[PDB]
């Protein structure tokens, strides 16, 4: 009659690293490595990212009529774009402090126009100023959110206000025209020596038109310049000018709901829902790590230059046909035929054999692994944020800066990843190997001098043992007076 | 018979391991600080510059309101409230204001002296003030500022200042934007004029910007201010033919280091303290706290957690190597004088006795772990909060990114230092208990019984002088091997 | 007869950490702190850096005199300057976005001068300017690559000239202009009053007006000279208006560019060596992960940390003469008598002797120590990154904002590269002591009560026991039936 201490093994091939050993095959593995995307275009919690594909945000704001079947949602998470968009400043000129106003509109509630100042009350200027730049159909055309050339001979100072009642904080955009010479300004506006002065309650400004020589830009040797403001409530904005102002028709009504980023891609909306959402696609994961894409939006798993991060979770596979010395040591091989457990014993007597998994030690096992996974996964933070950040070729000290502290996240991650995978799985096979050794002490301190030690983590006992008095064995209940019989052992 | 023990206590505090989640210990070690002070205090014996609700433009321009202020000349941080009522009393702006913030956080020497004796522009009106800046309620106007014309001639007011202070100078001066072209010829009889300031490193021009604008404190003008630090032994030129608002005073400042601003209600009560919070001051040797954020001085890091306990002591039973809460089923509330020990049984009595060998090591060992974890952290002097103007949000996102990627960093990283060392902690103290029970069985041999539950049962009559060389390792094998088990 | 277990001890010195214990001997050790540097300036990737010696960026691109034959590089990956350059702005004045130029041409390939404006086409204007404060010997000279216009005769018409990039490179241009001490220097240099200079490309749109007005001079100076540039796109024009106090360009920059880099403070001058990471000490050449040489590297670098020691353990702890109790434990000391391997066999017989290492453990053993050192080194990531930056007299936060990072980092590698070393020298110390004791447990198995086990690791044998059986223990075929007869004494 015989007990002997065995641990699972299988028809596994799965591999892990260790600090130790390299490709180690394991029973069981889980990665932590999120490495798929659905490869959609998706939704943020429920709201939907703004479309602008081939327009930029100054392009959709001014109303570049390129840029007029624009959906324009009443609410976004974040804002889609392609690359390089071709739709901006149709007519030629700059945008003050461009950046800023991007970064400001990322995430709005709550988004609503509103005619501010009615191109139809410029009445003592003309109003239908166009551009071949701005062409359509083609013929001279304009943005169409902005509106002053003389009317027949005289400009006359233009004065117009605007209350802001519309119960939100207001972005006002507003531009100067910069003339290619001095004819051209006394065509267009008559007077000479002008200026374009714009106030608020926080506002100071006045702008003088710049005549110069330049090369022509879509056919355009002029320029526009514009600048934008935040209108608050209850206040107001008074514009003035001589001449080369261009006036908005609309103010914009904004909510922030809180602050995300532009993503660049050529893809488009769908739905399909994600909370964290790649230029690639979209991420669905609890893992702690992925490695699709660096400019991500939403909550997600810690980016890392990893293309591979798997956890042992069973012990070492030893099919047959470590510090403590059990696995693959003392004990030569695992057991395919014992399913039901990690650990367990094989036994052998004139009631016959003889598997069983030994309940204890595998739940023990089962609680360790499960909690040390879940350790490593909900220890992790993950709050929401917007990777990409806009910079002008002006700020590329500032770009540099955003550049070298999103590296040197990703070093700390990976690095940390890396090691934290190779020092838990050497640590998890010593787990199991601990379990085995400790189990076979088990069995042999109750049987002590009743049973030989017949090595492969076997016993041989001294006594008839039946069905009754192994499962005592097996529960740790073993009765050892009964040392007689057992002198048969001399 | 001898038997091997470990200790145990009336403990229930719990740790957490990588394997295992609320295990009770004998004793435990919280790494983390969670108690203020409740006070706002000196910082390595120098107060802060208390401004109440005062900002700092309108304390170093004079607004009247911040008079009886009660400046001292040496500070460590500067002390305001989250949203100051008493700054710019005539409405307008201030240049590179945050780079000024934050050249003053932290200061010695400082101190306000006379540069342009206002008295001495003979040729301009210097009167002139505001009922924004009402007292009494009177026009006034900033006290360390001053010009319009004088009778109908504003001639170009040309005045010049040495720095022979022996220290660098702050300078602040203006320039007054009319409601109006016909405002501006009331105040300063010419149109087109310009403010230009020059010392030898700097070049500053600004013309008057006309806008039709909202009354602010009752105001449609506005003020722009600017500012310079002008060096030992050179000079400041000021040359305007109208709009200028001239400084009087000037600030003599020297500067150690760089500090922050901390917005609390709070005022200084007099205490000492290396680390400072909006809540109060932290006094602490641990790593870690959870205080709050916004922090100034020489502080732990700051982590998103609840709770970071390490275990010192062992498994409370009122592991790898199968000891503790192994075939040695529980502690012994007995054994007072150390983790790991004996209990014998003779003709003579019982029965316990504490390893100081293995208990010693033991404790050793645990210390060196405990500041090893501790005294590895740098701790070098900052300020958290810091002022960026509504222009410059993009760089205000990147600070807290900045923030966030620390604080995500830091609480992994100690919370999982805990799960881990808390499992070998644990497991140390197992095989501390083992590798004792392994040298008394490896020196009793045939001499005894392992009877499987940390026992021995002698073959031989062991007196209480056997029983002793058990303990101290010297038990005599051949003197008692006359065996007859 | 007797067999005992035992391991190397030798004559090291050399101590180590660990998370348990301070100051522990081993025999073994590697240091992954790389301390050492070649004392010398090189090139990067092959790439030599610009020397400027003692001249700043603007002081060789305007060409002040004592910069001029500076004698370029065509190409480079990196630029060095004294801490503090003695030459830049001869007549004093002011450089716009001058941070951003230099970290534009921190790294380029290709880089030309070339004559865009030869200074002759300038029929109606003088053109031979200069000052005092650019005396070269000691005549009146000026910015050599720069052209001061002033009045010819008594007049000062209109200045226009434009420029075609047909370089087949962007280029860089940049232009100034002059802020007079007063009204009588304005009508000596330009004749006009009332002023402006006026430049235009397809993006750059700009018109200044000279300030007049007293200044503590500088150089003997009072008047100052304020300098812009602009990057030139291939085939886009610049045009140069000015009706006085314009200082303008007579050559370009041809420039093309493959990344950034960074400029690097030193004494030090370019030496014949290459490096993927240089130093203001010295370059490093070395594949350990952590390093303390310096803060501001350039290249593919360690990560600096603060420490002056990380010392890994490899060998087992040195007890010339742990979890597992073996090594200085109940197998009190090693062997200084064995040396060819970590672990193994005593023995004493009739035929004497003597020592012999088991070459199986030591060998498994290195494997360990081999995965675990290289583990350390290879997981970590590394990217060029220059560490050095530029901000000016007004970007104190944003400078302060560079520091906090590197402070952070700092701060992160250090906390943990000391971590590791200490947890991974108490798991190297263990590792060992568990392999020991492994390999005493597989003897005791053997053996069984053929022998004594005594305590200290020697088993006394029942029986005369020759080499040849004392090999069979060592080979782990020892055959205890047949030795069986004949024990104790039977
Ligand atoms: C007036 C005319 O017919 N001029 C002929 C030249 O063409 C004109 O050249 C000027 C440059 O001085 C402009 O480019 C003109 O283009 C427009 C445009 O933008 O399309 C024409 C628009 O109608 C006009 N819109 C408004 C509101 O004024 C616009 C603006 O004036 C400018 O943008 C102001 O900066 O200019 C263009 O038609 C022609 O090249 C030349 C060849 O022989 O003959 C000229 O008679
Ligand atoms: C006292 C009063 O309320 N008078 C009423 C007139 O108000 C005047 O309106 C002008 C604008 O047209 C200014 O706001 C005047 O305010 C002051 C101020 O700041 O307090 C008066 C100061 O004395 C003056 N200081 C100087 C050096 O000139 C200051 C400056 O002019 C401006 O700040 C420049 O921007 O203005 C205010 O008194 C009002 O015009 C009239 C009804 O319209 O009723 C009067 O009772
Ligand atoms: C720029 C200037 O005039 N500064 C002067 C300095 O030249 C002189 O050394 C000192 C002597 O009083 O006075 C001050
Ligand atoms: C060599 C040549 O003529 N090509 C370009 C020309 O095409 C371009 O328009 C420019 C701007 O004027 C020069
Ligand atoms: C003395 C002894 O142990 N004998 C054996 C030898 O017969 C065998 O050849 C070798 C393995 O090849 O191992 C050993």
Not at 154 to 159: F, W
């Amino acid at each position: 009659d015989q007990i002997c201490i065995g641990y699972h093994a299988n028809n596994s091939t799965e591999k892990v690293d260790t600090i130790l050993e390299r490709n180690v095959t394991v029973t069981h593995a889980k990665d932590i490595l999120e490495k798929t995307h659905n490869g959609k275009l998706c939704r943020l919690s429920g709201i939907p990212p703004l479309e602008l594909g081939d327009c930029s945000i100054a392009g959709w704001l001014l109303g570049n009529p390129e840029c007029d079947r624009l959906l324009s949602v009443p609410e976004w998470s974040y804002i889609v774009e392609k690359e390089n968009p071709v739709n901006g400043l149709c007519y030629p000129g700059s945008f003050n402090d461009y950046e800023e106003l991007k970064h400001l509109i990322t995430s709005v509630t709550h988004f609503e126009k509103v005619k501010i100042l009615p191109r139809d009350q410029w009445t003592q200027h003309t109003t239908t100023g166009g551009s071949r730049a701005c062409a359509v159909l083609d013929n001279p055309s304009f943005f169409r959110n902005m509106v002053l050339t003389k009317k027949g001979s005289n400009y006359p100072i233009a004065k117009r206000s605007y209350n802001n009642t519309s119960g939100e904080q207001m972005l006002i955009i507003w531009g100067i025209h910069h003339p290619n010479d001095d004819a051209e300004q006394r065509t267009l506006y008559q007077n000479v020596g002008t200026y374009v002065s714009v106030g608020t309650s926080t506002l100071n400004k006045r702008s003088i038109p710049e005549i110069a020589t330049r090369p022509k830009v879509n056919g355009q040797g002029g320029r526009m310049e514009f600048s934008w403001t935040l209108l608050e409530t209850w206040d107001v904005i008074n514009f003035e000018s001589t001449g080369n102002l261009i006036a908005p028709e609309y103010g914009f009504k904004i909510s922030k709901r809180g602050s995300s980023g532009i993503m660049k891609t050529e893809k488009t909306l769908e739905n399909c829902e994600t909370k964290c959402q790649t230029p690639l696609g979209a991420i669905n994961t609890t893992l702690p790590f992925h490695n699709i894409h660096p400019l991500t939006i939403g909550e997600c798993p810690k980016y890392v230059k990893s293309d591979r991060l798997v956890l042992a979770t069973g012990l070492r596979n030893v099919p047959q046909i470590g510090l403590f010395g059990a696995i693959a040591g003392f004990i030569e091989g695992g057991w395919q035929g014992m399913v039901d457990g990690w650990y367990g014993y094989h036994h052998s007597n004139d009631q016959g054999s003889g598997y069983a998994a030994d309940k204890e030690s595998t739940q023990k096992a089962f609680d360790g692994i499960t909690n040390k996974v879940n350790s490593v996964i909900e220890k992790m933070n993950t709050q929401f944020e917007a990777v990409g950040k806009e910079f002008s070729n002006l700020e590329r000290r500032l770009e540099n800066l955003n550049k070298k502290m999103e590296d040197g996240f990703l070093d700390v991650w990976t690095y940390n990843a890396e090691l934290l995978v190779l020092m838990e799985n050497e640590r998890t096979l010593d787990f199991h190997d601990s379990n085995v050794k400790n189990l076979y002490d088990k069995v042999r301190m109750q049987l002590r001098d009743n049973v030989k030690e017949l090595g492969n983590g076997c016993f041989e006992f001294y006594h008839k043992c039946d069905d009754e008095c192994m499962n005592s064995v097996k529960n740790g209940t073993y009765d050892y007076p009964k040392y007689e019989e057992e002198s048969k052992a001399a």
